Design an enzyme around this catalytic site. Structure first.
Site, PDB file in Angstrom:
ATOM      1  N   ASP A  44       0.156   1.629  -4.200  1.00  0.00           N
ATOM      2  CA  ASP A  44      -0.912   2.092  -4.082  1.00  0.00           C
ATOM      3  C   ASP A  44      -2.030   1.324  -3.536  1.00  0.00           C
ATOM      4  OD1 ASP A  44      -3.669   2.089  -5.978  1.00  0.00           O
ATOM      5  OD2 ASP A  44      -3.043   3.382  -6.823  1.00  0.00           O
ATOM      6  N   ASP A  72       3.325  -9.461   0.727  1.00  0.00           N
ATOM      7  CA  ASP A  72       2.867 -10.022  -0.247  1.00  0.00           C
ATOM      8  C   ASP A  72       1.927  -8.317   0.092  1.00  0.00           C
ATOM      9  OD1 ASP A  72       1.236 -11.482  -1.702  1.00  0.00           O
ATOM     10  OD2 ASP A  72       0.998 -13.033  -0.413  1.00  0.00           O
ATOM     11  N   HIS A  85      -6.926  -0.937  -8.166  1.00  0.00           N
ATOM     12  CA  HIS A  85      -5.762   0.536  -8.886  1.00  0.00           C
ATOM     13  C   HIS A  85      -4.575   0.095  -8.985  1.00  0.00           C
ATOM     14  CE1 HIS A  85      -4.683   4.709  -9.277  1.00  0.00           C
ATOM     15  NE2 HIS A  85      -5.797   4.396 -10.177  1.00  0.00           N
ATOM     16  N   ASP A 155      -2.234  20.403   2.131  1.00  0.00           N
ATOM     17  CA  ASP A 155      -2.035  19.685   2.809  1.00  0.00           C
ATOM     18  C   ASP A 155      -0.414  19.049   2.077  1.00  0.00           C
ATOM     19  OD1 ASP A 155      -1.401  17.647   5.172  1.00  0.00           O
ATOM     20  OD2 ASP A 155      -2.691  16.268   5.221  1.00  0.00           O
ATOM     21  N   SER A 259      -4.889   9.635 -12.429  1.00  0.00           N
ATOM     22  CA  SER A 259      -3.419   8.132 -11.317  1.00  0.00           C
ATOM     23  C   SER A 259      -3.371   7.248 -13.093  1.00  0.00           C
ATOM     24  CB  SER A 259      -5.060   7.677 -11.089  1.00  0.00           C
ATOM     25  OG  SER A 259      -5.067   8.237 -10.062  1.00  0.00           O
TER      26      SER A 259
END
Ligand SMILES: *[C@@H]1O[C@H](CO)[C@@H](O)[C@H](O)[C@H]1NC(C)=O
Ligand SMILES: NC1=NCc2ccccc21
Ligand SMILES: NC1=NCc2ccccc21
Ligand SMILES: NC1=NCc2ccccc21
Ligand SMILES: [Ca+2]
Ligand SMILES: [Ca+2]
Ligand SMILES: [Ca+2]
Ligand SMILES: [Cl-]
Ligand code: NA
Ligand code: NA
Ligand code: NA
Ligand code: NA
Length: 472
Positions: A44, A72, A85, A155, A259
């Site tokens: 993410d 990192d 998120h 796609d 999500s």
């Protein structure tokens, strides 16, 4: 067993519920399964690795920064908190338990990492290097992203990312296969149809949709036949949402969308893999099919398939059931090697016009090493021209009578580009015998005089020839 004492655990209604509207996670915890030894990575926008509810479980070996090419994955801090998120998703899987902070992860003793890969230009190479991160250390990958949910895009993974999926399921995890958990999409308001998203439509991803607290199909949900199962997430403003770790060392009660469902599934899959570390990527999908629960999920399209399982295009086989998953995993017998039966259907191009039906009776590679009597995934790989793509609806009916919607009408899809060998996938005929008559239906759902031609229909069957249960 003593349930977590964390201050927001009572607000984690989809775990701590006592009213049977939950993911049955306490039952797995009480069986002794909390995620010990399992490694999950969130692909993410980064992970706040110093978050007080993540640091105890953070694994740098499950993490990388592909956007800036360094180890990192710390998020980029902005005034709008745009890059929060991945931290929210990470806490759903593996927030620390019994530490006086926020709530708990589903797999609160699992190790958790993040790949910072959405905060930049997301190329095929970026996706491939993320999906292929440390595949003999990371067991489970969680991804809540993909093609634009505008209801007009078709796609999927380009070459490097598709190669990453194939390498992951083939050689990842010691040859057992990387487990790729995917959110099915957030395009409901745009009437999006998630088989037009090649990441969730893949057989190599374990695709997850959402249900609201009251058991309804949320506004953002996409229906499609490629979805496998469901976890709770957000809905209307009277319904609760997902409670987890947030950017800047905070705690949110307002994580939302599909999500948020994929990380919860990834956590349940982590508990399951603790219960049986030898499960393959296909075994895990079998477990989900067998144990997921329709009960109290509301949809108008629940249908019983040929082996007696209820399926919906909104929910797949229903809600994940963590206690049932870990129980069934323990003595699970590894499925036989995957067979693939390729059936090229057409002998001539077919005009679509207002409506086209193609019927073909198949033997499913009878007499060959790829003979399939037990289906897993099926694909209808279609090549067709049409003047307005979103007016098309496409259905595939199995010999056992199971109607899979391969494509629903998409009102915003004005494309004149058709489908170029697009591998529409259905999970709804899992464990059926695919021998017999298959029917493909292509319909113009509009009153316009639309036109086009179907030039290729390949039916691709995956599965085995042994080990069936008595139908449900
Ligand atoms: C894992 O499953 C394979 C296939 O059935 C088997 O050969 C192997 O012995 C199993 N390993 C363990 C540790 O159970
Ligand atoms: N599968 C997905 N395509 C776009 C998207 C956004 C958010 C979650 C899942 C998806
Ligand atoms: N594959 C992708 N298409 C659009 C997009 C947005 C974000 C991440 C990946 C993708
Ligand atoms: N996996 C692949 N996607 C596009 C492509 C072209 C040629 C070889 C492999 C691929
Ligand atoms: Ca960095
Ligand atoms: Ca906590
Ligand atoms: Ca979509
Ligand atoms: Cl294949
Ligand atoms: Na692409
Ligand atoms: Na999938
Ligand atoms: Na039926
Ligand atoms: Na048959």
């Amino acid at each position: 067993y003593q349930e977590p004492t964390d201050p927001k655990f009572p607000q984690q209604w989809y775990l701590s519920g006592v009213t049977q509207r939950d993911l049955n996670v306490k039952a797995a915890w009480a069986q002794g399964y909390t995620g010990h030894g399992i490694v999950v990575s969130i692909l993410d926008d980064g992970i706040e690795k110093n978050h007080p509810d993540l640091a105890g479980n953070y694994d740098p070996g499950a993490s990388f920064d592909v956007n800036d090419q360094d180890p990192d994955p710390q998020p980029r801090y902005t005034q709008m908190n745009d890059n929060r998120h991945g931290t929210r998703c990470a806490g759903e899987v593996a927030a620390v338990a019994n530490n006086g902070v926020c709530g708990v992860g589903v797999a609160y003793n699992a190790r958790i990492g993040g790949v910072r890969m959405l905060d930049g230009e997301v190329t095929d190479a970026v996706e491939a290097r993320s999906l292929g991160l440390n595949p003999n250390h990371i067991h489970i990958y969680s991804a809540s992203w993909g093609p634009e949910d505008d209801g007009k895009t078709v796609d999927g993974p380009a070459r490097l990312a598709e190669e990453a999926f194939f390498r992951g399921v083939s050689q990842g995890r010691g040859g057992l296969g990387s487990i790729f958990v995917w959110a099915s999409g957030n395009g409901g308001r745009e009437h999006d149809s998630c088989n037009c998203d090649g990441y969730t439509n893949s057989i190599y991803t374990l695709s997850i949709s959402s249900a609201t607290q009251f058991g309804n199909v949320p506004w953002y949900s996409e229906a499609c036949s490629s979805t496998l199962a469901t976890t709770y997430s957000s809905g209307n403003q009277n319904e609760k949402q997902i409670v987890t770790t947030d950017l800047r060392q905070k705690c949110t009660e307002s994580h939302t969308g599909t999500s948020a469902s994929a990380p919860l599934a990834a956590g349940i899959i982590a508990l399951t893999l603790e219960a049986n570390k030898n499960l393959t990527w296909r075994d895990m999908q079998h477990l989900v099919v067998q144990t997921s629960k329709p009960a109290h999920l509301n949809a108008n399209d629940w249908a019983t398939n040929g082996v007696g399982r209820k399926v919906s295009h909104s929910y797949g086989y229903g809600l994940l059931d963590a206690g049932a998953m870990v129980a069934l995993a323990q003595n699970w017998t590894t499925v036989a090697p995957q067979r693939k039966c390729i059936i090229d259907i057409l002998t001539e191009p077919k005009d679509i016009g207002k409506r086209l039906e193609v019927r073909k009776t198949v033997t499913a590679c009878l007499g060959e090493p790829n003979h399939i009597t037990r289906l897993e995934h099926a694909q209808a790989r279609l090549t067709l021209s049409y003047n307005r793509r979103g007016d098309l609806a496409i259905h595939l009916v199995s010999p056992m009578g199971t109607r899979s919607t391969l494509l629903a009408a998409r009102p915003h899809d004005y494309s004149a580009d058709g489908f170029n060998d697009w591998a529409f996938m259905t999970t709804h005929s899992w464990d059926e015998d695919p021998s017999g008559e298959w029917v493909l239906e292509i319909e113009n759902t509009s009153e316009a005089n639309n036109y086009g031609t179907l030039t290729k229909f390949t039916l691709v069957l995956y599965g085995t020839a042994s080990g069936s249960l008595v139908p449900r």
